[PDB]
Amino acid sequence: YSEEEKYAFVNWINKALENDPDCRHVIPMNPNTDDLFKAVGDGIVLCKMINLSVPDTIDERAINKKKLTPFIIQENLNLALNSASAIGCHVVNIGAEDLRAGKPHLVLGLLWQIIKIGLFPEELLLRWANFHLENSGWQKINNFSADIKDSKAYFHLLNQIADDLKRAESMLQQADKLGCRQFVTPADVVSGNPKLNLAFVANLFNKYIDWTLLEGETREERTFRNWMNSLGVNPHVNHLYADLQDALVILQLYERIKVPVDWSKVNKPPYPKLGANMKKLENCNYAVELGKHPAKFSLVGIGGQDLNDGNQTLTLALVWQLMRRYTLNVLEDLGDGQKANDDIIVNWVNRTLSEAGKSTSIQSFKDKTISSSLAVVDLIDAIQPGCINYDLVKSGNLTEDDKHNNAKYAVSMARRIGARVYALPEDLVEVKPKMVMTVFACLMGRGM
Amino acid sequence: TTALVCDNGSGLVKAGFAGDDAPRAVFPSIVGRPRHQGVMVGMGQKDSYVGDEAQSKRGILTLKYPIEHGIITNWDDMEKIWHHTFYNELRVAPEEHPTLLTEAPLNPKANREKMTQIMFETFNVPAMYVAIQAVLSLYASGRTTGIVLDSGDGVTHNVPIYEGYALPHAIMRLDLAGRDLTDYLMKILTERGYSFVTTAEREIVRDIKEKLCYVALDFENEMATAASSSSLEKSYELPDGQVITIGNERFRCPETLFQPSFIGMESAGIHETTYNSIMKCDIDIRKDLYANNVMSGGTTMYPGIADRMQKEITALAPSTMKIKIIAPPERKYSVWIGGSILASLSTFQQMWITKQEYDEAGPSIVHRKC
Ligand SMILES: Nc1ncnc2c1ncn2[C@@H]1O[C@H](COP(=O)(O)OP(=O)(O)O)[C@@H](O)[C@H]1O
Ligand SMILES: [Mg+2]
């Protein structure tokens, strides 16, 4: 029949009683042996359990060094069971007489007290903690109160994401970075108390798109920088006249307006310390040549040295034209052929919003009803039903200043669903008709 | 949290979850104390034995029964008994698990109050409940109408229940279930050259009663058969090695239930008690009472208790309509099974005796919550 039934109980008792690691010299230390019954019946664990907080107590070798003579081994059991004042053997039925040998039910009843007294949105930020639990490959704990019941899986994944008052340091080490150690009791941390764990994990990873105003920068340059940042340039363009001197970003933008680029003639960003300026000038010259003949640009008096030297006028004259082709392509690929119009694309939002039904309808891009982000957020979830998220929306209680926040909120997830929106929130806050048109053009791209 | 159901009894105490069909706590309810001298160091360090820990060492120890017919006298040993029953056979924390308690009827308020305080003070209970054993045993048979004869080790009560309603004026209590039977057997065993005085032999006597004694159909015919023939002679093997053989004192012990004159008490037998309870009920509900006689407790498992009871009630019947005796196989755990079934219900979760209400109510909270 059954030769084994309860090796898992050894591991359970280990994970429960690691409050006092000194008990592991009596109970099995996770190797699922059977040393527990005889020595626990002698009450050695009761004297050991005090070592939870302070080791300065009854020592294992001081109370018993096995002067239990080869006939009478009857002295250790009562000597160690009399020290059961700690935790308390709530089973007062049992005496040291029966515990001399031990019984299953009696040992379980005493272990009940041992376990009992031995131990004293949220998901969007919890996933930013669970991302690392994947490692090579395994499931995700989610919160410490959701999936894990005992310490088995938690310790197993701790091996990759590395006294309960000190065993809680395992969970708190990812919290000790910002000093959030206290206010979560270790007893509840090990017990997996839900409410304490949800907020603790959530508020930790809340700080785990750039919308700032520089000291000197025109709105035109801000629009340029935001457009290239939103289009997916390999570097992070922070200054137009300091990041485009290598003409690499311009080349990256070239293929996105359907201009072929031969990368075999392009010097890689790793530049030798000798002749690097010559390589950058060559790159600028090649960019100008690619923009002139096959791309048909109007750049009079513009050379490679101007882009290399960061001439602001000629660089702006190139970037604004680059967006001219980009917007032309965005408005052309939506139609059957080489046609682009505004009245055909203005009633699309009025027609597709009738599928669900909401009180948002605009006449044109110059309407003042799009001053707030209600119109764009009303459409942003029409295509994708999974992005309702009206938690941060404002309707009827919006002032001039507070609609910047919801404008940014509506713009941010446009790239989440798939609209490659390169629009500054300010251009949507105002009634600039040229660029909210680009917003709707990018919306139609994912829409149909 | 899963509900807990504990069935306390003078001889056997039961415990388990709510919903389980099988009991967990199977142990005699006895108390033993050391009484010999230890010449070797390290011994004599125990206050009181409880249950099988004394059963396994019934030579050098005494036997104490703190439960005297459902009456709780010494609560120091009862603390040990409840600690044995709960943690050794549940392993769950009563501090966050509801526990359903059992209590014999016609119990003075002091006993119920003290067992309530013990739960609410010695333990830290979130929500408790106390129920009658007879009422709980009705749910084991799957019926809600009819009398239930609950006969444990020292408690024998009859609580007639009609369509869920019970009659307080038809509830009585008899203190003859298993303990006075054991005393009668150990007294009459001395007529065959045997000695039974100390309690060390009480468990052996109880086992002999459980495996030999049986309720006879006709007592006079059994006397004639035992005196004339020697066919009903069965032997027992004593643990020490001697062999005993009893043939007449087998069916004499169970006959004390029907004939109380053997132990010398003015009360009636078990067969007349249910008839008197029925007579105390309405005349339009006796139809549901004659055909519904659910048996329970530790006493009514003798080989021939159902037929004898049926014959006794038929002799008491006006010869109008049929008598039905229900004897389920799980008569030892009918109370516990019924309590588990009742606590498993969704309705039963809304009248447990919570601690917050007890804190401002006081000690009498069980009296109107149960
Ligand atoms: N099979 C049996 N036949 C006769 N008597 C029995 C049998 N089993 C137990 N008893 C007697 O009944 C008593 C046990 O009652 P108990 O189990 O405490 O009742 P309850 O189940 O109501 O608590 C003991 O005296 C025991 O001798
Ligand atoms: Mg009972």
PDB file of C-alpha atoms in Angstrom, chain A residues 156-262:
ATOM      1  CA  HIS A 156      11.415  29.587  -5.353  1.00  0.00           C
ATOM      2  CA  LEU A 157      10.852  32.833  -7.257  1.00  0.00           C
ATOM      3  CA  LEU A 158      12.839  34.764  -4.637  1.00  0.00           C
ATOM      4  CA  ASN A 159      15.811  32.678  -5.755  1.00  0.00           C
ATOM      5  CA  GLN A 160      15.426  34.687  -8.993  1.00  0.00           C
ATOM      6  CA  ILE A 161      14.136  38.082  -7.792  1.00  0.00           C
ATOM      7  CA  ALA A 162      16.461  38.417  -4.793  1.00  0.00           C
ATOM      8  CA  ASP A 163      12.348  35.160  12.441  1.00  0.00           C
ATOM      9  CA  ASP A 164       9.509  36.509  10.310  1.00  0.00           C
ATOM     10  CA  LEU A 165      10.464  39.978  11.564  1.00  0.00           C
ATOM     11  CA  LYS A 166      13.657  39.371   9.558  1.00  0.00           C
ATOM     12  CA  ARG A 167      12.186  36.969   6.989  1.00  0.00           C
ATOM     13  CA  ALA A 168       9.969  39.843   5.836  1.00  0.00           C
ATOM     14  CA  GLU A 169      13.209  41.438   4.622  1.00  0.00           C
ATOM     15  CA  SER A 170      12.850  39.135   1.606  1.00  0.00           C
ATOM     16  CA  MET A 171       9.747  41.067   0.536  1.00  0.00           C
ATOM     17  CA  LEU A 172      11.029  44.410   1.845  1.00  0.00           C
ATOM     18  CA  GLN A 173      14.399  44.394   0.041  1.00  0.00           C
ATOM     19  CA  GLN A 174      12.716  45.676  -3.123  1.00  0.00           C
ATOM     20  CA  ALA A 175      11.114  48.262  -0.810  1.00  0.00           C
ATOM     21  CA  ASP A 176      14.263  49.264   1.096  1.00  0.00           C
ATOM     22  CA  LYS A 177      15.465  51.148  -1.996  1.00  0.00           C
ATOM     23  CA  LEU A 178      13.040  54.015  -1.264  1.00  0.00           C
ATOM     24  CA  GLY A 179      12.893  53.365   2.487  1.00  0.00           C
ATOM     25  CA  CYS A 180       9.388  51.838   2.491  1.00  0.00           C
ATOM     26  CA  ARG A 181      10.236  49.107   5.014  1.00  0.00           C
ATOM     27  CA  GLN A 182       7.945  49.845   7.966  1.00  0.00           C
ATOM     28  CA  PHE A 183       4.131  50.277   8.141  1.00  0.00           C
ATOM     29  CA  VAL A 184       3.808  46.728   6.809  1.00  0.00           C
ATOM     30  CA  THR A 185       3.893  44.334   9.751  1.00  0.00           C
ATOM     31  CA  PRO A 186       6.050  41.231   9.150  1.00  0.00           C
ATOM     32  CA  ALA A 187       3.340  39.033  10.678  1.00  0.00           C
ATOM     33  CA  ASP A 188       0.862  40.195   8.033  1.00  0.00           C
ATOM     34  CA  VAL A 189       3.568  40.170   5.346  1.00  0.00           C
ATOM     35  CA  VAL A 190       4.268  36.475   5.926  1.00  0.00           C
ATOM     36  CA  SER A 191       0.558  35.742   6.466  1.00  0.00           C
ATOM     37  CA  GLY A 192      -0.261  37.420   3.145  1.00  0.00           C
ATOM     38  CA  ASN A 193      -2.761  39.935   4.492  1.00  0.00           C
ATOM     39  CA  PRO A 194      -4.464  41.346   1.357  1.00  0.00           C
ATOM     40  CA  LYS A 195      -5.178  44.992   2.155  1.00  0.00           C
ATOM     41  CA  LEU A 196      -1.697  45.745   3.496  1.00  0.00           C
ATOM     42  CA  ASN A 197      -0.059  43.999   0.528  1.00  0.00           C
ATOM     43  CA  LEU A 198      -2.058  45.612  -2.306  1.00  0.00           C
ATOM     44  CA  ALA A 199      -1.225  49.216  -1.402  1.00  0.00           C
ATOM     45  CA  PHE A 200       2.348  48.363  -0.390  1.00  0.00           C
ATOM     46  CA  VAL A 201       3.116  46.808  -3.779  1.00  0.00           C
ATOM     47  CA  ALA A 202       1.130  49.447  -5.685  1.00  0.00           C
ATOM     48  CA  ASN A 203       2.672  52.629  -4.266  1.00  0.00           C
ATOM     49  CA  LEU A 204       6.194  51.185  -4.601  1.00  0.00           C
ATOM     50  CA  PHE A 205       6.303  50.842  -8.390  1.00  0.00           C
ATOM     51  CA  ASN A 206       4.390  54.009  -9.339  1.00  0.00           C
ATOM     52  CA  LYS A 207       7.757  55.555 -10.313  1.00  0.00           C
ATOM     53  CA  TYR A 208       9.364  52.457 -11.869  1.00  0.00           C
ATOM     54  CA  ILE A 209       6.309  60.793 -22.476  1.00  0.00           C
ATOM     55  CA  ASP A 210       8.390  63.966 -22.191  1.00  0.00           C
ATOM     56  CA  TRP A 211       6.141  67.051 -21.997  1.00  0.00           C
ATOM     57  CA  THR A 212       8.319  69.916 -20.743  1.00  0.00           C
ATOM     58  CA  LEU A 213       8.923  73.543 -21.709  1.00  0.00           C
ATOM     59  CA  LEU A 214      12.522  74.548 -22.369  1.00  0.00           C
ATOM     60  CA  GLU A 215      13.939  77.926 -21.373  1.00  0.00           C
ATOM     61  CA  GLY A 216      14.351  79.066 -24.971  1.00  0.00           C
ATOM     62  CA  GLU A 217      12.334  77.288 -27.658  1.00  0.00           C
ATOM     63  CA  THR A 218       9.634  78.387 -30.088  1.00  0.00           C
ATOM     64  CA  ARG A 219       6.418  76.407 -30.438  1.00  0.00           C
ATOM     65  CA  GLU A 220       7.532  75.446 -33.954  1.00  0.00           C
ATOM     66  CA  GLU A 221      10.711  73.777 -32.665  1.00  0.00           C
ATOM     67  CA  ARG A 222       8.710  72.108 -29.885  1.00  0.00           C
ATOM     68  CA  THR A 223       6.364  70.669 -32.513  1.00  0.00           C
ATOM     69  CA  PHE A 224       9.383  69.481 -34.510  1.00  0.00           C
ATOM     70  CA  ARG A 225      10.958  67.739 -31.518  1.00  0.00           C
ATOM     71  CA  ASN A 226       7.690  66.151 -30.395  1.00  0.00           C
ATOM     72  CA  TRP A 227       7.031  64.889 -33.927  1.00  0.00           C
ATOM     73  CA  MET A 228      10.423  63.198 -34.262  1.00  0.00           C
ATOM     74  CA  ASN A 229      10.212  61.789 -30.726  1.00  0.00           C
ATOM     75  CA  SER A 230       6.754  60.334 -31.405  1.00  0.00           C
ATOM     76  CA  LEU A 231       7.801  58.940 -34.802  1.00  0.00           C
ATOM     77  CA  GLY A 232      10.332  56.608 -33.167  1.00  0.00           C
ATOM     78  CA  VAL A 233      13.836  57.958 -33.725  1.00  0.00           C
ATOM     79  CA  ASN A 234      16.608  55.748 -32.361  1.00  0.00           C
ATOM     80  CA  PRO A 235      18.186  58.510 -30.210  1.00  0.00           C
ATOM     81  CA  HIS A 236      16.226  60.857 -27.966  1.00  0.00           C
ATOM     82  CA  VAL A 237      16.203  64.243 -29.701  1.00  0.00           C
ATOM     83  CA  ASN A 238      16.459  66.917 -26.992  1.00  0.00           C
ATOM     84  CA  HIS A 239      17.836  69.808 -29.078  1.00  0.00           C
ATOM     85  CA  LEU A 240      17.177  70.297 -32.786  1.00  0.00           C
ATOM     86  CA  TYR A 241      20.449  72.146 -33.424  1.00  0.00           C
ATOM     87  CA  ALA A 242      22.583  69.788 -31.306  1.00  0.00           C
ATOM     88  CA  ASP A 243      21.297  66.305 -32.253  1.00  0.00           C
ATOM     89  CA  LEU A 244      20.853  66.656 -36.038  1.00  0.00           C
ATOM     90  CA  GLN A 245      24.483  67.570 -36.795  1.00  0.00           C
ATOM     91  CA  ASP A 246      25.258  63.922 -37.641  1.00  0.00           C
ATOM     92  CA  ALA A 247      22.322  63.655 -40.111  1.00  0.00           C
ATOM     93  CA  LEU A 248      21.540  60.178 -38.740  1.00  0.00           C
ATOM     94  CA  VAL A 249      18.121  61.211 -37.416  1.00  0.00           C
ATOM     95  CA  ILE A 250      17.339  62.839 -40.771  1.00  0.00           C
ATOM     96  CA  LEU A 251      18.217  59.585 -42.532  1.00  0.00           C
ATOM     97  CA  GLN A 252      15.996  57.666 -40.098  1.00  0.00           C
ATOM     98  CA  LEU A 253      13.145  60.056 -40.918  1.00  0.00           C
ATOM     99  CA  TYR A 254      13.805  59.627 -44.654  1.00  0.00           C
ATOM    100  CA  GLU A 255      12.544  56.035 -44.939  1.00  0.00           C
ATOM    101  CA  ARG A 256       9.378  56.937 -43.021  1.00  0.00           C
ATOM    102  CA  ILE A 257       8.352  59.353 -45.795  1.00  0.00           C
ATOM    103  CA  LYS A 258       8.967  56.559 -48.330  1.00  0.00           C
ATOM    104  CA  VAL A 259      12.414  57.792 -49.403  1.00  0.00           C
ATOM    105  CA  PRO A 260      14.823  54.855 -49.912  1.00  0.00           C
ATOM    106  CA  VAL A 261      18.162  55.169 -48.118  1.00  0.00           C
ATOM    107  CA  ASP A 262      21.340  53.250 -48.948  1.00  0.00           C
TER     108      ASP A 262
END
